């Protein structure tokens, strides 16, 4: 009854926690019931990563539940690839078709691709961070060459935080000589609240600028700041939270001691936690389909040192891999299915422009069909005041003498 | 097979590294505090107890492309290799106006 | 020496002086000059335009 499994957790990630234990006790049935073992530790460092993983090897789990940063990535895709370990994340996903990776987070470079193409841009500004792999950033320039765009690629990650407000000034100083207008924050939610800061200071936000924010938790961040501004800012967002089901979801969130589960009594959750909790129900409902299948998982014996030369792997790895490959079921990131490889597919993402009112559901697209929403006959706002403008010259437009 | 030279307990190391593997030698050097020597590409950063023997080829890289006085060209990568150098030219390609 | 993940990490002390050894050696050879920073990155070192 009890199945034994790993979780990697960033040290400053509670909420992404926090939709875990939640998970935990939604889904539990009285056939069986997950044991985690929570490992708190600093992502990036892989040696760390390396230390973890084999922690949970040798403890002998089935299946681990963790995240990565560039900088440790292929430590995690590498041992699964080997050992046979299925791994599931809510991270970006791996640049590439790596087994025994279960990414619950959807591809986003299909979105970004062709919301360009719907507002018909043809030269941009793209802030990418290296944070969460160059993936898109070679996709921005393969396609940039075949409809001839005129991108200006700005690697904005490296940067201090002490000498913040010069070199702030100073990007925007370069982007002036284009006289750009339009923009694309490829940060994570963190850094892109650190960039729309310093966009109000020197006030690029007012009519004429448009901005799109490239991750999936447009309403995740702050947008209240650059809302009345006047400049037009697009977005993503996975969580629907028109969904009965996240609304269900919602109502039970927004009402939990904070004290047990930080930050948890808001009404709204991140992109990152969600699929956290999404990731519970696949991996529940994986191994109830062992069960039914009637298919035996429990390992024979010690797993043994991770290191093993020769690296033996156990076989009923595979079984997992094709039982998480193989879960298809419906949580707060709208469908959920997975291909091969792993990757999200036969998704659904959101496309949201902010206005007046606040956020509003503008489109969405799949990886079938691009940008189809039409329309929002309903919200609307039925409020623009045109901008004219003209010269003093006399007598076209003359000064009253009042 | 980092390991399997600190069991051996060697002094030093010297290897190379992809742009895939480079990340587990620095952090791994970095807290056993064995010293990698190594002529693979410079790392993206400052990492401690590394030695890297290939120059750092792309402040050299700049300076050629403003004597031949360019301003619109091709730049061919390839992702196996990596494109620390491709980053490099693409953030001064607004101030020096380049069409990259 | 044991096992690289031993728990928790003990970083052998003569590390740290094999450290400051190797960015101290400055000599000749075959790209020009070598001497290194604290990093370990080449300094006053030389690239032919060719
Ligand atoms: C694809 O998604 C649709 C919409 O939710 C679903 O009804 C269908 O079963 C899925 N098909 C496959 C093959 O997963
Ligand atoms: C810098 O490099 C030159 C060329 O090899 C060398 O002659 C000089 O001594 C170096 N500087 C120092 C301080 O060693």
């Not at 959807?106 to 030269?123: F, M, R």
């Not at 850094?191 to 004429?208: A, L, M, P, Y």
């Not at 003093?392 to 000064?399: D, I």
Request: a negative charge; aromatic letters at 10%; glycine letters at 8%.
């Amino acid at each position: 009854n009890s199945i034994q499994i790993g979780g990697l957790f960033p040290r400053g990630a509670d909420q992404e926690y926090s939709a875990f234990r939640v998970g935990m006790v939604q889904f539990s049935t009285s056939e069986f019931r997950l044991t985690p073992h929570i490992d708190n530790l600093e992502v990036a460092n892989s040696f760390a990563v390396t230390n973890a993983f084999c922690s949970q090897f040798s403890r002998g789990v089935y299946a681990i539940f963790g995240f990565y940063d560039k900088k440790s990535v292929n430590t995690i895709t590498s041992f699964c690839g080997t050992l046979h370990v299925s791994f599931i994340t809510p991270s970006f996903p791996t640049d590439g078709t790596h087994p025994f990776v279960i990414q619950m987070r959807p591809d986003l470079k299909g979105a970004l691709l062709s919301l360009i193409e719907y507002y018909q841009w043809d030269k941009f500004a793209y802030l990418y961070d290296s944070d969460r792999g160059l993936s898109t950033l070679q996709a921005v320039l393969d396609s940039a060459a075949e409809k001839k765009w005129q991108v200006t690629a700005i690697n904005v990650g490296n940067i201090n935080n002490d000498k913040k407000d010069e070199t702030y000034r100073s990007l925007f100083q370069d982007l002036e000589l284009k006289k750009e207008r339009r923009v694309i924050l490829d940060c994570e939610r963190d850094k892109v609240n650190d960039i729309v800061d310093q966009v109000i200071t020197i006030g690029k936000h007012v009519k004429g600028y448009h901005y799109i924010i490239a991750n999936l938790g447009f309403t995740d961040g702050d947008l209240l700041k650059i809302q009345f501004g006047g400049a037009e800012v697009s977005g993503f967002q996975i969580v629907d939270y028109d969904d009965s089901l996240v609304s269900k979801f919602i109502e039970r969130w927004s009402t939990l001691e904070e004290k047990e589960y930080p930050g948890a009594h808001t009404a709204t959750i991140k992109y990152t936690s969600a699929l956290t909790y999404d990731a519970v129900q696949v991996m529940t409902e994986a191994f109830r389909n062992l069960r039914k299948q009637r298919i035996e998982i429990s390992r024979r014996g010690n797993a043994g040192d991770c290191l093993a030369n020769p690296a033996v792997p156990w076989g009923q790895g595979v079984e997992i891999e094709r039982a998480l490959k193989q879960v298809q079921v419906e949580g707060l990131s709208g469908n959920i299915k997975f291909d091969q490889n792993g990757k999200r597919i036969n998704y659904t993402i959101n496309i949201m422009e902010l206005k007046t009112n606040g956020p509003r559901k503008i489109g969405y697209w799949s990886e079938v069909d691009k940008m189809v929403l039409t329309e929002d006959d309903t919200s609307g706002l039925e409020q623009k005041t045109v901008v004219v403008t003209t010269i003093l010259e006399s007598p076209y437009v003359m000064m009253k003498k009042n």
